[PDB]
Amino acid sequence: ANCRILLTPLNERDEQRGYSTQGLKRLSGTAKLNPRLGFTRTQFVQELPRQQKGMSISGYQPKLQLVLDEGEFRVVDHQGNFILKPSPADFPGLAENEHATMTLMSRLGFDVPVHGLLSFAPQSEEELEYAFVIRRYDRDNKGLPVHQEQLDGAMQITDKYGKTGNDNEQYVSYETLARFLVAHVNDNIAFKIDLFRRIVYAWLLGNNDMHLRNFGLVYSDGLTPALAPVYQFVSVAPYPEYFYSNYLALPLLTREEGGRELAPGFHSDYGEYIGQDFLLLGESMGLAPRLLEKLFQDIRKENAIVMETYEQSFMTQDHIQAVLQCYRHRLGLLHHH
Template sequence: MNLQHCLINLNKLQGSELDSGYSLLGIKSLFSNKDMILNLPFTRSQFIQELPERQKGMSISGYQPKLSLYVKDNILQVINNNGTYILKPSPEEYPYLAENEHATMMVMQRLKFSIPPFGLFRFKQEDGKPEEFAFVIKRYDRIGSDAVRLHQEQLDGAMGINDKYGLSEGKKAVSYESAAKYLITNVNNSLKSKRDIFLRIVYAYVLGNNDYHLRNMGIILPDNAPPSLAPVYDFVSVVPYPSAFTEYLALPLLALEENDIDTAPGLNSKYGEYIGFDFILLAEHIDINLKLAQKWLGDIINSHQLIIDTYNESHMPEEHRELVLAYVARRINLLKITTL
């Protein structure tokens, strides 16, 4: 744990903030209420054994057990329907995943992506057991004081695909290139939107998020406004978990790789991994000007120090931080290779 940095926004704690682990700015950013009671009113054991039973039928994509929460009497309380927050602990098979998601989402937030407010919260402590944290994030698909549900669709459903990894007959049939083209054609074809989509894909590669699949890309469908790409969510680095980190990306990068028809140039080179050249190809295939693609790739390379600082300020264990940062350094160097 990094006891000097806020469990919400990673700001340096001052004075009495050091006792709680939360900065006033962090609390206000997540709850708009400085009087919140910040420790969870239940233990991790209660969460695992009892509370999800009260929420049968709740459906949120992802592999972590989750709870829907709302604020009542300045406390995060469990609710079956219309919750305004989601709570995710670290699964036993993926220790410290809550801290990992917090750190990785903070990287994305500092990179100016659209991110719902989020933070880390302590479970009620059990005798003789170490302190444990859960990741809590505000739902972006609930609006107004009545928490009205905002209609949305995950990308696999929108594209009529039955598998979140785009699998068909044992082969990956959907690439990030195809996913990006669908979003550009059907949601928003502005340069700003193209940049957002492109950067999300590149940062999934850089940060080791090989679980950035079609169901982790959402489309918001409001009644009285054009559709839009949902904020970034479920963004983690899988690098510290070797059993799950068996591929660089959840989907093939380029359309030519779909159904194993061909291989991306970087994978087929002496490097054996995706390189900057491959991401330049992706950009060109989704109608991003070459010079602009090169500039954006340069911006990503220049964000290396921000990534280092954020993970070092985070609450991830040191061993996990070191694994992630070594991986990021390798990816950054590969992005610098733009010719073959």
């Protein structure tokens, strides 16, 4: 009864279709879009053997390049306008996870490309398999290429996680990264709040793989760069090994680089990142203390949206149960200054 694009309830006229007219409009730019793909999974997604074992979940996700031919999707081999991310073979339901999270991000007001869930043509009367589709952000209105760059390259960092030393420690942090960003984009307060909330919400939602290749710079309005939209936002809470590996992808504070110093929350009885650690991050960004208090109050008010969006999503419940456990836990830690 919920929309496979917007996760909003369907309206009788749309219930049988499974997609609201609002969602089909938002994705394609046309209301006559066919979200039922005309190809099966195995027709274009060829599974390679063995893969790896120590890779992050994103490294197992296949990517297909899609284009919109007269309201119908068609797989191209080079330069598409859409990207289709099916669930990896070993992580069933990941596409519904990315769709759930990125819908929440969009509902919380972040800059998110239009996205949704498309289904593969069935093979033999099995349950329909749905995959995650998203519009590419390095294209403009006429589908013309827009230049972009990932942060690992801009910061001249050789590793997604900053493991650039003679040990196993990380030498780039979210604080250090934010200081780099304000040096090269427009320093307005609206940008600083958004970036601060991206970091707090990656922690709250369990995205411990927001590394330097998941930040981007878009060269749209002339030579001045802008922060790229949210992407690759998945909650790792349903997967306990990958989740218990790290609290976030990067150290939160600059004092933590190289394992030289611990975040204040690590010395507390909670032993993880807490609210005072995120206050110190905001302080370094130049956010006023009065503002951060209000910023924290807003985040508390948004758990209503967080509960709702995940509960009306298409993930498996034991996965939804996992995300809300992590969220409620870390949202509780924000109160400790």
